[PDB]
Write a protein that binds this ligand. Structure first.
Ligand SMILES: CCCCCCCCCCCCCCCCCC(=O)OC[C@H](COP(=O)([O-])OCC(O)COP(=O)([O-])OC[C@@H](COC(=O)CCCCCCCCCCCCCCCCC)OC(=O)CCCCCCCCCCCCCCCCC)OC(=O)CCCCCCCCCCCCCCCCC
Ligand code: BCL
Ligand code: BCL
Ligand code: BCL
Ligand SMILES: CC[C@H]1c2cc3[nH]c4c(c3C)C(=O)[C@H](C(=O)OC)c4c3nc(cc4[nH]c(cc(n2)[C@@H]1C)c(C(C)=O)c4C)[C@@H](C)[C@@H]3CCC(=O)OC/C=C(\C)CCC[C@@H](C)CCC[C@H](C)CCCC(C)C
Ligand SMILES: CC[C@H]1c2cc3[nH]c4c(c3C)C(=O)[C@H](C(=O)OC)c4c3nc(cc4[nH]c(cc(n2)[C@@H]1C)c(C(C)=O)c4C)[C@@H](C)[C@@H]3CCC(=O)OC/C=C(\C)CCC[C@H](C)CCC[C@H](C)CCCC(C)C
Ligand SMILES: COC1=C(OC)C(=O)C(C/C=C(\C)CC/C=C(\C)CC/C=C(\C)CC/C=C(\C)CC/C=C(\C)CC/C=C(\C)CC/C=C(\C)CC/C=C(\C)CC/C=C(\C)CCC=C(C)C)=C(C)C1=O
Ligand SMILES: COC1=C(OC)C(=O)C(C/C=C(\C)CC/C=C(\C)CC/C=C(\C)CC/C=C(\C)CC/C=C(\C)CC/C=C(\C)CC/C=C(\C)CC/C=C(\C)CC/C=C(\C)CCC=C(C)C)=C(C)C1=O
Ligand SMILES: COC(C)(C)C(=O)C/C=C(\C)CC/C=C(\C)CC/C=C(\C)CCCC/C(C)=C/CC[C@H](C)CC/C=C(\C)CCC=C(C)C
Ligand SMILES: CCCCCCCCCCCC[N+](C)(C)[O-]
Ligand SMILES: CCCCCCCCCCCC[N+](C)(C)[O-]
Ligand SMILES: [Fe+3]
Lengths: 281, 240, 302
């Protein structure tokens, strides 16, 4: 039930709403008002999926798929079997995520720790909402959103992307990718540094963060430090997801043509737009 | 075919990996226990990992984990319900008894040494060459509490020499004694330092150190711990 | 509001840290560089010193001749006209030799030879630097983790321009050198093999790519939240568990049923990220050599 050192930590208090009504634990899971709001939105939402499963004629996860209401419906409502369920489910879903964020806030409070984890999470939630909400609304229908299916949601990425040619040319999507790459690199390096210092060669004594800060200076001529590498992770991670929403919010709204033809602003600049030779000349 | 074989292999591999990874995160905190401190029944699918010994630097001994765990201190808590799974109420003054968000750990009562044998955290007056390169200089400023009434003034900046970074701010009260407030708990301003965590009358409560030139691992925790638990316990003495 | 510890609020400077010695040849470490007050808010402000040495300069050189070789070819395409260079900078490209030549080196410089040169000079530069990351750890008596993890990144890169082009039969299946051009290769490659999306590895590969953004945002934010207890001082928390290590675990135990240790999380961290290039490397290796179309493969699994 408890970690050898957990009892001194489980004290009353920290609850944003409710007081002490749901201020207890279920096994190793902390409950809380939002702990109960979550189980609700989730249970109900899982039901709407098993029901959108009988209406499709399949119980195979690899087949099961909940599609959005066709473009003819706009931002209006739709019959359950035809766009209805997805819509309640996006509500149950959005309701499950925000409620899980607020449940971490109550946890944060108990322990007296910082509210950086729920904050971070909120960036994830915003990406989801960018796709199932902010973008569709801006375009004019819930048909521009993605479906809830293991392989059908990928069909959407695929079709959605090429709908503008090689999506690779989206400037924002371009940036967003580097942060995703960098983060991995940093995550590799970091977990690889700490582990090496605390796990040296045989018979040798545990190295110190001084050996660590050296190692990198000897390697790249610089050591960001402990507090820095963590500020770096968090920053690259969130920055990576920030440019992913930004690349999609502008796709179909301010820019709806071929992304490759956008980079023609740079090439057709009066200064060199007509000098013969090169690739375009 | 190969592909189908490569992929069937991976998942078998990944399963051993997750197996491998989880047992490793059980070196500390396990085995689990019942609310009364006795060995819990259901310990989970994964078993405890074979012990591993670390060789602490500067010949300070060894560390074997998993190893016999103990809080090595008295806990001032009591049950609030007759069923396992509820909060335990502080029998005294949480801040002083060391529980909840104000609890600490019985770390080693020895200061931290850098790669070269020297204490890792020193005051700045004892740190030759160090100075405030940028940002407002806290030393000299009054420290205000979460009740808007002054509690003291900054006298020095205990810095981390190896990472050249301020960890604490020495503070002088009325009785003329000093205290350590963690850097990550104060807002340094243009004319004052703010501590939303503690209220005027709680700085004296802060645990004090034995040597005026060193903070031990144990003392670091009591300090940081005490300062943090006041976000909950000092709440009735704050205004926004 | 509350302090978030994102940016330092007070900077502190002391005598340039020349670092630990151990079995290092202090004769190679250069001098201390300047101090960047700018970089000093995020983290440390000390630039330098950097350990050069034999194998290290080798890499630096091989790495510059790679950039310079691609550069002069970029200029041949630019017609040595300064204005064109900045214009079509992303359009240019040093493509690999025609499929006709196959795996030979007797190709002309204006039709593929200049590529091969560039690739040899980069084959040297990367491997020699790999070795540098291993040796630089041997000298400090540390574990070779950074070494092995850098190997996986190489695994993908190798497969992309060495191992695969050789298993296929020509240097034409290799990746070109250009901004936009290597962006089309990526797209083409999927198209030619039936949309990579149907590739189990490429999809397992994205699982970890996203997973790294989740683990690192998670780890970083958790460590920042507990730094008020000396969380960022992990190695320290490893040899002596403090309240920062227990509260950090308890938050995640009460949130999702299970937690990790100050060290354990760095084993998730390291493996989570490495498994990115490890899988996408098996996926690209088996693509075009054992499997011609992934949609097809997808219907069978044989
Ligand atoms: C085809 C692919 C080929 C492509 C090449 C790319 C290879 C890239 C691999 C990079 C690995 C990164 C690992 C990071 C790491 O731990 O490094 C430190 C680790 C220790 O470093 P150290 O400095 O020597 O020691 C310091 C301390 O003494 C000791 O320090 P320590 O305690 O930190 O190290 C102990 C560490 C030791 O780590 C290792 O021993 C590394 C193991 C490498 C595995 C390589 C993966 C291959 C993927 C295969 C996929 C199949 C598809 C076909 O423990 C582990 O991590 C154990 C890993 C658990 C694996 C689980 C296996 C399950 C098998 C199935 C069982 C059945 C399940 C039931 C159902 O390095 C190694 O051990 C080197 C591995 C090099 C092998 C490369 C492969 C050659 C080809
Ligand atoms: C994985 C499948 C494809 C692929 C798909 C994509 C896609 C899709 C995208 C990129 C993107 C990039 N890719 Mg690519 N990329 C591949 C293999 C590579 C290899 C390689 C040696 O194997 C290299 C060096 C690159 C290089 C690059 C950068 C130009 C750019 C940002 C990468 C990054 O964030 O790294 C992070 C790492 C670092 C900390 C260090 C490296 C720093 C960067 C700036 C590299 C500079 C060196 C030099 C080659 C750049 C020249 C530009 C100026 C003329 C100086 N790619 C393979 C073939 N790559 C993004 C881009 O913007 O393209 C235009 C993008 O959207
Ligand atoms: C954000 C970018 C694109 C997109 C592009 C892709 C691409 C491209 C790929 C995936 C892949 C996956 N996607 Mg997707 N995906 C999007 C939005 C989502 C949403 C969402 C609610 O917003 C979710 C839940 C998923 C979930 C998933 C998984 C099924 C799979 C592995 C992801 C992973 O490892 O992440 C990292 C996270 C973790 C390791 C934490 C644990 C995550 C587990 C695996 C979650 C599974 C949930 C799933 C089974 C449904 C449960 C819902 C109900 C409660 C039953 N995607 C949008 C539209 N997705 C890959 C795949 O192989 O699937 C076909 C793949 O190739
Ligand atoms: C139209 C495009 C195709 C497609 C075609 C490909 C191809 C082709 C490939 C990928 C690859 C990848 N794809 Mg895909 N992919 C598509 C859509 C997606 C989507 C999505 C739709 O949302 C996502 C999330 C991804 C994500 C990814 C990554 C998981 C994966 C590469 C991981 C990596 O970090 O390599 C980045 C890391 C490296 C290249 C390692 C290189 C390391 C070297 C040593 C660096 C040296 C630097 C150099 C010397 C210069 C020095 C630097 C300077 C000093 C600055 N793909 C569609 C279906 N994808 C790769 C893969 O693994 O697939 C299985 C790959 O080859
Ligand atoms: C496990 C997967 C991830 C990973 C891990 C990884 N990469 C690594 C490592 C590890 C663990 C290292 O230890 C090693 C390293 O030393 O990093 C600090 C490396 C590394 N990964 C690098 C890049 C890199 N890794 C990438 C990817 C990834 N690496 C994965 C996501 C990518 C991509 C494409 O995503 C890139 C671009 C290098 C930074 C470094 C390997 C360095 C190397 O081999 O150098 C060889 C050659 C030279 C010395 C060339 C120098 C030539 C330059 C002077 C030319 C450019 C000049 C330019 C205009 C300069 C200005 C830049 C401005 C920003 C100021
Ligand atoms: C912002 C940077 C990255 C990030 C960070 C991040 N994620 C986080 C956190 C953080 C900091 C957490 O604290 C929180 C966590 O607790 O992690 C363990 C979380 C988390 N990120 C998760 C997943 C996740 N994060 C992802 C992405 C990312 N997370 C980013 C790349 C992804 C993908 C696809 O990249 C996934 C799959 C969860 C493991 C966890 C949040 C768990 C949670 O919200 O529980 C509440 C909800 C339920 C129990 C289930 C609800 C069921 C629904 C009502 C119905 C199902 C609808 C769904 C839309 C169907 C989709 C089907 C698909 C096939 C498309
Ligand atoms: C124990 O610890 C540790 C240390 O300490 C001892 C360490 O030192 C280290 C070592 C770590 C390092 C030296 C740091 C390494 C990190 C990096 C490789 C670099 C960080 C990279 C970035 C900040 C940039 C990434 C982003 C890229 C490539 C894109 C560039 C773009 C922008 C900044 C945005 C451009 C945009 C505009 C103008 C907006 C335009 C708008 C529209 C299009 C719309 C480690 C690992 C460690 O573990
Ligand atoms: C240094 O410090 C640190 C730690 O430790 C000291 C840590 O542990 C962690 C956390 C990280 C790990 C343990 C590593 C492994 C983690 C991952 C790969 C992340 C991916 C995570 C998952 C797949 C797990 C997802 C699980 C979830 C969301 C919960 C599962 C939940 C259920 C089955 C039930 C959900 C709950 C409900 C319905 C409500 C509560 C319950 C009621 C009945 C009411 C980090 C980051 C860290 O930095
Ligand atoms: C300012 O102008 C001057 C001239 C001064 C410059 O210097 C400017 C220079 C620039 C314009 C340079 C620009 C350079 C880029 C745009 C480079 C971009 C590079 C990429 C996008 C590369 C992507 C992918 C590369 C891959 C996967 C390479 C793989 C290489 C290998 C595995 C090596 C394989 C080895 C070969 C085939 C030969 C082996 C031979 C043996 C004998 C072993
Ligand atoms: C008291 C025992 C409690 C054990 C419960 C452990 C929860 C496991 C974490 C969720 C599993 C996740 N999943 C499905 C993504 O793999
Ligand atoms: C993709 C990530 C999946 C995480 C793997 C799940 C591990 C569950 C471990 C449960 C541990 C149970 N215990 C001992 C804490 O009660
Ligand atoms: Fe860490």
């Amino acid at each position: 039930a408890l970690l050898s050192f957990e009892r001194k930590y489980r004290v009353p208090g920290g609850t944003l709403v409710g007081g002490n009504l749901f201020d207890f634990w279920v096994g190793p899971f902390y409950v809380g008002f939002f702990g109960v709001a979550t189980f609700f939105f989730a249970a109900l939402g899982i039901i709407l999926i098993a029901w959108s499963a009988v209406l499709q004629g399949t119980w195979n996860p690899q087949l099961i798929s909940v599609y959005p209401p066709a473009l003819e419906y706009g931002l209006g409502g739709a019959p359950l079997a035809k766009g209805g369920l997805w819509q309640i489910i996006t509500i149950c879903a959005t309701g499950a995520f925000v409620s899980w964020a607020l449940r971490e806030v109550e946890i944060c409070r108990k322990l007296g720790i910082g509210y950086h984890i729920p904050f971070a999470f909120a960036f994830a939630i915003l990406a989801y909402l960018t796709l199932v909400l902010f973008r569709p609304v801006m375009m004019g229908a819930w048909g521009y959103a993605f479906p809830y299916g293991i392989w059908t949601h990928l069909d959407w990425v695929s079709n959605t992307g090429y709908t503008y040619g090689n999506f690779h040319y989206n400037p924002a999507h371009m940036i967003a990718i580097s942060f995703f790459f960098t983060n991995a690199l940093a995550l590799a390096l970091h977990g690889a540094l700490v582990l090496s210092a605390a796990n040296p060669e045989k018979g040798k004594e545990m190295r110190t963060p001084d050996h660590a800060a050296t190692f990198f200076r000897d390697l790249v001529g610089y050591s960001i430090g402990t507090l820095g590498i963590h500020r770096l992770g968090l920053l690259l991670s969130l920055s990576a997801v920030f440019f992913s929403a930004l690349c999609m919010i502008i796709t179909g709204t301010i820019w709806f043509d071929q992304w490759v033809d956008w980079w023609q602003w740079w090439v057709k600049l009066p200064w060199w737009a007509n000098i013969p030779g090169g690739i375009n000349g | 075919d190969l592909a189908s074989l490569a992929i069937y292999s991976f998942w078998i591999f990944l399963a051993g990996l997750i197996y491998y990874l989880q047992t490793e995160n059980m070196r500390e905190g396990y085995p689990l226990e019942n609310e009364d401190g006795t060995p819990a029944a259901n310990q989970g699918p994964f078993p405890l990992p074979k012990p591993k010994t670390f060789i602490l630097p500067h010949g300070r001994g060894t560390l074997t984990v998993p190893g016999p765990e103990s809080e090595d201190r008295p806990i001032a808590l009591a049950r609030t319900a007759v069923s396992e799974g509820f909060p335990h109420a502080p029998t005294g003054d949480p801040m002083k008894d060391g529980v909840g968000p104000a609890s600490w750990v019985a770390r080693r009562d020895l200061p931290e040494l850098d790669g070269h044998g020297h204490n890792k955290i020193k005051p700045m007056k004892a740190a030759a060459g160090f100075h405030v390169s940028a940002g407002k200089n806290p030393i000299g400023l009054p420290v205000r509490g979460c009740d808007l009434e002054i509690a003291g003034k900054v006298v020095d900046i205990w810095v981390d020499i190896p990472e050249q970074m301020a960890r604490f701010l020495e503070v002088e009260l009325k009785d003329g004694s000093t205290r350590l407030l963690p850097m990550q708990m104060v807002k340094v301003q243009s004319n004052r330092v703010h501590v939303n965590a503690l209220s005027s009358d709680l700085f004296a409560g802060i645990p004090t150190i034995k040597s005026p030139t060193e903070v031990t691992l144990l003392e670091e925790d009591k300090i940081c711990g005490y300062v943090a638990g006041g976000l909950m316990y000092a709440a009735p003495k704050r205004k926004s | 509001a509350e302090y978030q510890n994102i940016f330092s609020q007070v900077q502190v400077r002391g005598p340039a840290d020349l670092g630990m010695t151990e079995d290092v040849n202090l004769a190679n470490r250069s001098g201390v560089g300047p101090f960047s007050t700018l970089l000093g808010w995020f983290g440390n402000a000390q630039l330098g010193p950097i350990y050069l040495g034999s194998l290290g300069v080798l890499s630096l050189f091989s790495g510059l001749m790679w950039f310079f070789t691609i550069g002069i070819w970029f200029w041949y395409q630019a017609g040595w006209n300064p204005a064109v260079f900045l214009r079509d900078l992303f359009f240019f490209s040093l493509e690999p030799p025609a499929p006709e030549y196959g795996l030979s080196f007797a190709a002309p410089l204006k039709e593929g030879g200049l590529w091969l040169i560039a690739s040899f000079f980069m084959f040297v530069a990367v491997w020699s630097w790999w070795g540098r990351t291993y040796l630089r750890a041997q000298a400090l008596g540390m574990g070779k983790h950074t070494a092995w993890a850098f190997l996986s990144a190489i695994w993908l890169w190798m497969v992309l321009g060495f191992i695969r082009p050789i298993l296929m039969g020509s240097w034409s299946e290799a990746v070109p050198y250009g901004i936009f051009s290597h962006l089309d290769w990526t797209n083409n490659f999927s198209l030619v093999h039936g949309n990579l999306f149907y590739n189990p590895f490429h999809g397992l590969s994205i699982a970890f790519l996203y997973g790294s953004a989740l683990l690192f945002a998670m780890h970083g934010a958790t460590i920042l939240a507990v730094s008020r207890f000396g969380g960022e001082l992990e190695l320290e928390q490893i040899a002596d568990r403090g309240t920062a290590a227990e509260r950090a675990a308890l938050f995640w135990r009460w949130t999702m049923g299970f937690n990790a240790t100050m060290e354990g999380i760095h084993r998730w961290a390291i493996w989570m990220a490495v498994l990115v290039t490890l899988t996408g490397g098996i996926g690209i290796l088996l693509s075009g050599t054992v499997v011609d179309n992934w949609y097809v493969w997808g219907q069978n699994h044989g």
